[model samples]
Target: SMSVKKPKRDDSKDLALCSMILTEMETHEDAWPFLLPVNLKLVPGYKKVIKKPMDFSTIREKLSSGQYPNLETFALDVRLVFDNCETFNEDDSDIGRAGHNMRKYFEKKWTDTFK
Candidate 1:
């Protein structure tokens, strides 16, 4: 038997879609809260609450590094960011409102792109 690793299927099309969606979100005005990791200093209780603190920057890094094997996996992380936001902030608050908006935008884009 050959020692080389098995070849994986070409998934550039799916990856490109993921990248496009991510770029759109990054450019959105409401994306500020999710652009990077939450400020741990100002929000000391954040870590204790959000078990998996995800963000756009982290997702971008994972995408570029090929950490996400498929679109579904990538989408999971994207959703996690919004879910965490809702858990930490109130619906009327700035960040919370933005998170809801961002979630709607992403879900719409995902359907438009894939469906």
Candidate 2:
């Protein structure tokens, strides 16, 4: 059976989206609050943080703090924050797709920023 392939190791893409989020948080005002009805867990082990309109601040915090040196680790951390929105799978839902779409969008923005 054919298995899944690997992915990008560069974190610039993911980092851009995180930074973009922080930038927009200043103007959006809502910041991490979701417009939708779904509220996913921030992390599996945490309980107090499971509620409210949590978003990518954790990702932003990690990146800005230089917590994750590798993109794969950073991406995994992003997934942890987003996985709760899955309700099933990320590709199957709008909230989930945002994660997908942002990653791709920043992939371009990151490349363009460097070039």
Candidate 3:
């Protein structure tokens, strides 16, 4: 005979895990370019190209606000930040290089911890 217990999904565990990863990203040296939003006036036409620009600060706020229901949502936003960087800057450029490093770090952590 089998027991009749159902396994419930744990949101708190994922929240803690996501927050830990985010903290690491925020402290990363290469995180400078993604700490805040791109300067609209300084970078003309940025708005036109990057439709959904993302950043560390925005992810932090969203995490705090409980906007992410699952790890996938959180990862989606994190990847958005890097994707926007790649789309807006050249690979050899300073910000572009930083974004590349940041993405690499995040992906490594993601795989090591969750996969």
Candidate 4:
């Protein structure tokens, strides 16, 4: 049983993406309304692995304020969820794969929805 730890974010890259998403959300009035309603929930099963969940909330606030720090916690959070899935052993690989795919899908949707 190989237990892989969560993936840490490459601060430089993710911060840039976050900044781009924020700017797209701000510059496009159509996306502004959905910003608040966008339900960006931490994947439930992996929440325990996150060291500082509140950091994501802080990132959100900073994004809104146009003050993006060079560090982001999103990739780390997603990696935690992936690692959790990899740890679980089940017969139905399809279900597990779907869950993983959904995470990425939702991430892209969230980004594009705000763009």
Candidate 5:
């Protein structure tokens, strides 16, 4: 049996694998009207959210303050972001593979985390 070993304190896999989706969201959020994946309690407002036109800023904020403390949660949360947008389907070709690619990249670096 494997003994308990501390998971390496790796820096986020691009904020724990987020830049791609956020950048895509930032680029063309107007095309898909959806809420952001952020803690409404901290950024709880209407104008502060709508003014930016994307979830990037919120993504950055939440990720910074321990929103998704682990890679799995990060992946799950990112998927949730994708779930809210038609542009980010995990089964599609372009947008879907964007996440696939990003996840692959992270898996390459953090070999132990992907499984």
Candidate 6:
């Protein structure tokens, strides 16, 4: 006689299982040879907000220090300041591109240090 097999509870458990396994392996002493230290320090809440007059100096310092994880967050904060500025243009503007460029610059610098 042939027997039918039933799916196990949590049929998608493999995904969670794999994730747990990988995390465990990553923290394991045997995996030390394959891992590198990453500076994942969290920036304080006060430093995350953009101040009036749009200070680029402070933004530059944060980006250069790799305090922000990626360009998206940096760009969003810059856009917020620009949107609030009286002189900001609604069209034919370079602010967005400038923000993207700044992100690229920081990303390049961050990657370079790892190499």
Best by lDDT: 1
lDDT of 1 by residue, 16-89 (tens): 88999999999999999999999878898998888899999999999999999889999999999999999999
- The residue-by-residue lDDT of candidate 5 on 15-105, one tens digit each, is 6345554454445524232334444456445335333233445556776787766556655554545443333354555655554554454
lDDT of 3 at 67: 93
What are the runs in model 6 whose C-alpha is more than 4 Å off?
Answer: 1-53, 87-115
User: What tens digits encode model 6's per-residue C-alpha lDDT throughout 72-98?
Assistant: 455554444434332332334454444
Q: Ranking under lDDT, best-scoring first?
A: 1, 3, 2, 5, 4, 6
Runs of candidate 5 exceeding 4 Å displacement? 4-12, 29-32, 35-58, 82-115
**What lDDT score goes with residue 96 in model 1?**
94
Tens-digit per-residue lDDT, 1-115, candidate 3: 2876678665557888889999999999889999998888899989899999899999999999989878999999999999999998999999999989999999999998788
TM-score list, all predictions:
0.88, 0.38, 0.89, 0.29, 0.36, 0.28
Q: What TM-score does model 5 achieve against the real structure?
A: 0.36
- Which model is ahead, 2 or 6, in terms of lDDT? 2
RMSD of each: 4.4, 9.2, 3.5, 12.1, 9.1, 16.8
TM-score, cand. 4: 0.29
lDDT of each: 0.94, 0.50, 0.91, 0.45, 0.49, 0.40
State which candidate, 1 or 6, has the greater lDDT: 1
What would the per-residue lDDT of candidate 4 be over residues 2-108, giving only the tens digit for each residue?
78867864444555566565454334433222233222363454345434333224446655565644433444443444444445424257636644554465468
In candidate 1, residue 41 scores what lDDT?
80
Each model's total of backbone clashes: 0, 0, 0, 0, 1, 0
Which stretches of candidate 1 lie above 4 Å from their native place?
1-11
